[PDB]
Design a protein around this ligand. Structure first.
Ligand SMILES: C[C@@H]1O[C@@H](O[C@@H]2[C@@H](O)[C@H](O)O[C@H](CO)[C@H]2O[C@@H]2O[C@H](CO)[C@H](O)[C@H](O)[C@H]2O)[C@@H](O)[C@H](O)[C@@H]1O
Lengths: 314, 307
């Protein structure tokens, strides 16, 4: 079964690490951090890895139930919630995953909305449940962020109107802050089971192996609740590629596919890249920053090569 | 002839094409009195997007643009006029043969979400916001809409602005939630244009089959839902494949892959919607692992096995 990529321009792609459109292709050869994100991880033959799942609505989302209001030193009102799998089934910590699928894979203050629809209905309102929603922040670096143990903590500006024991949804929107005390680092994994435990069942780190090559990312800019900043989230492959590879499950005929970024109008190749078996791209480039390319461009599979193939310089 | 296919995705692997929500259940309502003519999640079986349908899950009920100024309105809150562009940032051209910018909401109600701004390091702000799509100030086809905030002051004019949808503000009577009532995209007293066609069963005993999602509420009593004709992944798949339609009606089977058994069959119509032979309203209670598989091309006279 021939390997294929979908035919989608950057303007038709979304980020696999946060619910955002892809804005630009991006490189940063001098990156000092280990790149080991857990969302948007899929092998070329269709095996999802890390915390990766298929739903665009599931990325950095949580489902569960608030247990109670809790105490925390930080400003705001704090709440504990148990989390389930996104499909509502109980999360089994013995499963070979780092955390419930969809769990955020970076350190920071994730801003979004907590909403609730009560289980109990009220006769005075046509047997319909009561509802509420409020802005919320989940600090993934907090010792109380323990999704692999089945519960996390979120804060609200709202001081009162969050109900205990009721079905609860977190819809991610952006970051609360990227100032020094908000610990935003897109390549630092949360400690899924708490302070000082080792994460397990991780998708592997990724890196170029050929001299002169660097990782190529699909970059999205992420909204901020407040403060100064222009934060971005870089994924290895867009969510549509994860979805495509999963559907196709085409056998990988080598460890590296040669792909070309093409301008369909001219038919000309804008640059070429290596698409590695574990599900990431490298290019021959010696600079950091956006890849300035025609809007109509997209990657096309060329052939299976090997790790010694020399890419044409971007 | 390139064979027609559907993706292999359980309900738990599908998302709504009319609001950014997971699909919760399959659903029927044979006694529905409204004309079904939604504009998002519209795609022919040979891959032609229609109405306001676009490919991004992040674009559904989203807006991009710039606030012009604070304005006044009868509705509760503080109100803001915003010009809207295409979701890709290019200027929206009202002369294009679309009902409204792609992604524009296709139903009447108070849509709740978050407005965020990043100034042209830049300063930022975000606030809860509501867009009343039934309002005379909801004029996306004219290039501008109005949103309200609880926040009274800190919304900046002339700055890049994003609306991220989250749910509904209310489904009280005065919030005019009706998922089958289209907004007037050019405002009061104007006719919508370039619409995807209405859909309906034509065969006796048949009813539409929907992919249903429950939509969050900011407050109040209710259990509102949004029904789409096909999930967003089907729109994305059909667009990619562009397989020729060999008749007006495809026969599809909802299969349990474990047992291999067919749970029921349905008609998948050329314009991009499903019908089944069912005489009841409510969820289709089916195993979690089930999904639709293309069987064969049939015609309008094919008699579906009763569900
Ligand atoms: C059902 C209720 O909805 C929300 O409170 C609403 C609020 O959104 C609206 O603006 O004002 C009404 C009051 O007229 C609020 O509804 C009352 O909330 C009470 C509790 O605060 C109580 O439930 C009354 O029966 C409601 O009429 C939510 O904020 C609230 O938690 C609750 O789900």
């Amino acid at each position: 079964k021939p390997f294929t990529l979908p035919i989608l321009t950057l303007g038709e792609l979304t980020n696999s690490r946060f619910p955002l459109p892809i804005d630009v292709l991006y490189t940063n050869p001098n990156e000092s951090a280990i790149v080991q994100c857990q969302n948007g991880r899929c092998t070329l033959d269709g095996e999802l890895q890390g915390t990766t799942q298929l739903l665009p609505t599931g990325i950095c989302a949580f489902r569960g139930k608030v247990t109670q209001q809790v105490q925390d030193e930080h400003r705001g009102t704090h709440w504990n919630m148990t989390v389930t799998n996104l499909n509502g089934t109980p999360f089994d910590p013995t499963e070979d995953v780092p955390a419930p699928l969809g769990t955020p894979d970076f350190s920071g203050q994730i801003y979004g909305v907590i909403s609730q629809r009560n289980t109990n209905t009220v006769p005075g309102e046509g047997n319909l449940p009561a509802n509420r929603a409020h802005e919320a922040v989940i600090a993934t670096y907090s010792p109380k962020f323990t999704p692999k143990l089945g519960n996390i903590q979120f804060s609200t500006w709202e001081t009162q109107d969050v109900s205990s024991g009721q079905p609860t949804k977190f819809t991610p929107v952006g970051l609360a802050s990227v100032d020094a005390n908000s610990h935003f680092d897109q390549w630092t994994l949360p400690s899924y089971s708490g302070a000082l435990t080792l994460n397990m069942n991780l998708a592997p780190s990724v890196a170029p192996v050929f001299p002169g090559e660097c990782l190529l990312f699909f970059r999205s800019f992420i909204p901020l609740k407040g403060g100064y900043g222009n934060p971005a989230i870089d994924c290895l492959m867009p969510q549509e590629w994860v979805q495509h590879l999963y559907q196709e499950s085409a056998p990988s005929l080598s460890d590296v596919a040669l792909v070309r970024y093409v301008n369909p109008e001219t038919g000309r190749t804008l640059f070429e890249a290596k698409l590695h078996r574990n599900g990431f791209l490298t290019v021959a480039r010696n600079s950091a920053g956006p890849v300035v390319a025609p809007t109509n461009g997209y990657f096309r599979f060329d052939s299976w090569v090997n790790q010694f193939y020399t890419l044409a310089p971007m």
